[PDB]
Amino acid sequence: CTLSAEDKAAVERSKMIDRNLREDGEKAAREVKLLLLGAGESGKSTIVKQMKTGIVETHFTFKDLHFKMFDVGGQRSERKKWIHCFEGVTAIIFCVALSDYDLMNRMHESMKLFDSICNNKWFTDTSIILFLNKKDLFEEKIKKSPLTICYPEYAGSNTYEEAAAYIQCQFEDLNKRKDTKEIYTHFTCATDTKNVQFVFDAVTDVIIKNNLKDCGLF
Amino acid sequence: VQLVESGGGLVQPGGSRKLSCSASGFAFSSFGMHWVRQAPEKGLEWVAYISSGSGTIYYADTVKGRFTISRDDPKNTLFLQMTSLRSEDTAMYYCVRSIYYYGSSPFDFWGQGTTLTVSSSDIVMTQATSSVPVTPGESVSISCRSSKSLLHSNGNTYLYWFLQRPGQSPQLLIYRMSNLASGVPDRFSGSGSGTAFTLTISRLEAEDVGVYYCMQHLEYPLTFGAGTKLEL
Amino acid sequence: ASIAQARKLVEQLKMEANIDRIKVSKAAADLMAYCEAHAKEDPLLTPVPASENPFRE
Amino acid sequence: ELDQLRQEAEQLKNQIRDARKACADATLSQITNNIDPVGRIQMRTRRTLRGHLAKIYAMHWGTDSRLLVSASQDGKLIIWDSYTTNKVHAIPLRSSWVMTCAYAPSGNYVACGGLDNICSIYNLKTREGNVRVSRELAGHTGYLSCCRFLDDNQIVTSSGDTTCALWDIETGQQTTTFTGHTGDVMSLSLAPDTRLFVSGACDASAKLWDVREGMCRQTFTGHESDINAICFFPNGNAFATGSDDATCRLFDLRADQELMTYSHDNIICGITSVSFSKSGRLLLAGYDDFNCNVWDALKADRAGVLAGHDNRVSCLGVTDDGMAVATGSWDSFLKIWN
Amino acid sequence: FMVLNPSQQLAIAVLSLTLGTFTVLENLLVLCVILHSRSLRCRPSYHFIGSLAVADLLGSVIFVYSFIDFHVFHRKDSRNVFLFKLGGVTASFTASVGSLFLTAIDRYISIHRPLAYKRIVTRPKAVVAFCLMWTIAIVIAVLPLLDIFPHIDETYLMFWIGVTSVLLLFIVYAYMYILWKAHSHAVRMIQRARMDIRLAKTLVLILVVLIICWGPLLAIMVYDVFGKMNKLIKTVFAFCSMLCLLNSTVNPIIYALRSKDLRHAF
Ligand SMILES: COC(=O)[C@@H](NC(=O)c1nn(Cc2ccc(F)cc2)c2ccccc12)C(C)(C)C
Secondary structure, eight states, rough: OOOOOOHHHHHHHHHHHHHHHHHHHHHHSSEEEEESSSSSSSSHHHTTTTTTTOOOOOOOOOOOOOEEEEOOTOSOOOOHHHHHTTTTTTEEEEEEEEEGGTTTTHHHHHHHHHHHHHTTTTSSSSOOOOEEEEEEEEHHHHSSOOOSSOOOOEEEEEEEHHHHHHHHHHHHHHOOOOOOOBOOOOOOOOSSSSSHHHHHHHHHHHHHHHHHTTTTTT | EEEEEEEEEOOTTTTOOOEEEEEEOGGGGOOOEEEEEEEETOEEEEEEEEEEGGOOOOOOOGGGGTEEEEEEEETTTTEEEEEEGGGOOOOEEEEEEEEEEOTTOTEEEEEOOOEEEEOOOOOOOOOOOOOOOOOTTOOOOEEESSSSSOOOSSSSEEEEEEETTTTSSEEEEEEETTTTTTTTTTTTEEESSSEEEEEEEEEOOOOOOEEEEEOOOOOOOOOOOOOEOOOO | OOHHHHHHHHHHHHHHHHHOOOHHHHHHHHHHHTTSSSSTTTTTTOOTTTOOOOOOO | OHHHTTTTHHHHHHHHHHHHHHOOOOOOHHHTTTOOOOOOOOOOEEEEEEOSSSEEEEEEEOOOEEEEEETTTTEEEEEEESSSOOEEEEEESSOOOOEEEOTTTSSSSEEEETTTEEEEEEEOSSSSOOOOEEEEEOOOOOOOEEEEEETTTTTEEEETEEEEEEESSSSSSSSSSEEOOOOOOEEEEEOSSEEEEEEEETHHHHEEEETTTEEEEEEEEOOOOOOEEEEEOOSSEEEEETTTTTEEEEEETTTTTTEEEETTTTSOOEEEEEEEEESSSSSEEESSSSSEEEESSSSSEEEEEEEOOSSSEEEEEOTSSOOOOEEEEEEEEEEEEE | OOOGGGGGGHHTTTTHHHTTEEEEEEHHHHHGGGTOOOSSSSSSSHHHHHHHHHHHHHHHHHTTTTHHTTTTTOOOOSSTTTTHHHHHHHHHHHHHHHHHHHHHHHHHHHHHHSTTTTTOOOSSTTHHHHHHHHHHHHHHHOOOOOOOSSSSOOHHHHHHHHHHHTTTTTTHHHHHHHHHHHHHHHHHHHHOSSSSSEEEEHHHHHHHHHHHHHHHHHHHHHTTSSSSSOHHHHHHHHHTTTTTHHHHHHHIIIIIIITTTTTTTO
């Protein structure tokens, strides 16, 4: 065999490390990984608290499905260098504040960041569970401060009917890959924990559409 | 790090005991575990071997069917089940921990040993010397010839030198060859090539006194040379 | 405000300008003298026999 | 003074740009011409270290030229035996977002760091038989992009906060801090004497440091984009830097300028890693387009290719006795070439 | 017993070569994705299609080689060795249904248990169950080693129906279910059907193609025991078996190409 008595026990050690790696990867394949992005003022900090320095993991098991949520807000580096580390997350929860259309260069900057990660080369197959935070504060901000300040071309109502849904069209229009990516917008309720329900129902749709794409059934 | 094994005592022949060594202070799951028997006023003799994960068990030809080595990783205990104890099984049974990877040091820690007085082809390591008298500060040389070249084709020559002080358990001094075990004074040095091996002590001290065994770990069973005692 | 920051960049460029520089001819030919005095002991430039490498099989 | 810089600092960078032209009487590719090429270099994949499940971002040989650690994005750090492709250790990481690893020159320690902003030091020769986290070196405010041991008690890290820092590992305190760069420090490289090290940043400049003085001794700029990789010539008197603009360059420490440029028109992708062979005649470069070209260092010709990866070659390393070249890639396989 | 239309006895043996034209330009281009590997194209549901990619190539030649044999013109037959040419016709027609079955047994657990898909179908499996479709394609290929159309038994002729007909019920329940659960799912999200039309116009075509393949032939081939076999029924059963090479062109093209997975490699 040309393996000494110690060269054979070193290979038994190697094959016992192989199973712990094969097993410890199966235990971390049951977990859905979710990048969390967005110009962080008020929304990103509450949705991870809505669900319960460099990277901030957050576990939450909803309905027999273990989620990991990686918040990268406290990195503060050239995002182009570490963003490929997150290639291969199920989805990209992109928190956004509806209360920043009048703070107007902030809502228009979140649209500049959404367009940056939504159109990376690393995220051509990664959907976006876009949250729109504080629609209560968007209720009475329009009550005094109308729209069209952050969107001059907005020719419409101000009664929150086409007001909010004009935000939801501006982001989803920024998607330059309509075929290989699906934005799943949601207006965060914050009075119920159906926010995790929307994440759960938007992840079970990403996984299935990956499974169907993995087996080539599309 | 400590291996404390109890069980045994006196046993009438044909009986059965259950030696157990309760490891504590190290990753017991990662370590292969030997048993090493030492008859009264005699040499060391390998008994059994259970690797890490229990995926391998070897025995000496003397105990091939009578002894059953087994380990309880969640409990950190090594067991030796004996059946039909013969009078030749009377000895102090040491539990030895050995970890095998590239660059490791097998046989580096030996349990204190549990005594067991029963009522009433292979590499041959030959160090036919005995009772080499010396005084401290002297330079001593010890040799043991192997019946086969312990130099394996991969460059490693598998010769281990052990030191059993009086009343202690053995201590690893030199693994494969000229590799000084951690915690050993560097005055010890190991030399050899092929079938002739030498343990050189540069300046002997008051604690460098006791029987010095050499072991081949080239293939199983593991054979110890007879004792080379150093009395001052 | 930032005069102390532009005060230190000059403090660096003051140091990074008075180095003594040998011309490229004396420092390119001094790299050939290394790559040509060590061409023997590199197994990747002059491929050795299968007897000597440890990765033969 | 023209916002207090252009008075001298903008002309002082022309004293330098005029001194570096005075000392360039002839280029490396003129005097090192009419010498024999190295011939086509067919390196075959001698090993394939399988067992990582995520992308391998970092790799580093041990000084014995046999063992090598590797860090993948799953929270695992594997210490391989390269001759017999066994796994000596598999080290679970607290943070899974590893971007760099390093093996101590004594073989007793290994370091690890990434997006967690920490360089963990792992003790390999423990008495317990497992690998413990001997130290966690925190203090950088950006991701650790590269770490390198000086010895068992000194490690120089480099971070995405535009800062490199020497460390004392017994304590947890950085005894020097190197603060010259205006961009993310992406890679550092110790000189063979461990008294100087170069670092390359996303501001397209590489800076020579002095480990004792802590002072940026020299500054090199030839690239148009980020310097992903940097490696000293084995002499210690030159280094090569690979950047996002698909070009390697050989910079000269005593001449204080760029000696050559290693580019090719079919190549458009960034360079993830770079390394010299022993004697420094071959410049290996790990490209973004799945390959690993082999540049004649004294000439400029790509004298070979190592095209055995199915994904970006994220890290390569030439073993310290020169025998082999290890390349990792985002396909979870270390290939040991030879 | 070979029986051919004497009015145009030439017109039928001549069609043997005309039918064998294709299944060379398409199914040969389908297995070269191993040559265009690192696309990447080699995951557990692409060597199941690779299985039928070759088994559709084996029986593509094994079957055409029989209609140059045909029991009358080219080395008519024997009583012992001829069956191992039968062993080829079952080695492929059952390797096809073995490949076609497994490819619908991972597409079932793909959408039935979508979270636990990666934990079930992997590298270790899908080569085990792979070869088992190539192994019992042979062990179900030799009864006489351990009496109407070629020479073979009528009690074993139904047992192969016991296999192929049963594997075509679990390939229909799988794909029909995958439009059910796709329909319950895709409606619920709009409840809070956009996928069930991108998926209905590819799953109902697999069953339309499948029914025209194994519907008539298995029908006539089971008319033997459910009726009295006449010489007037197998005048076109020789022709009706043309469809067994008809799906020889659709299997590599439906399961691989017109699904847009292969369409990005080209
Ligand atoms: C073996 O004589 C043949 O050459 C037949 N060849 C087949 O390829 C074939 N054999 N069967 C049924 C079958 C029965 C028992 C068995 F063990 C394996 C197969 C077919 C059914 C439909 C279409 C073609 C075929 C042929 C007479 C139908 C051309």
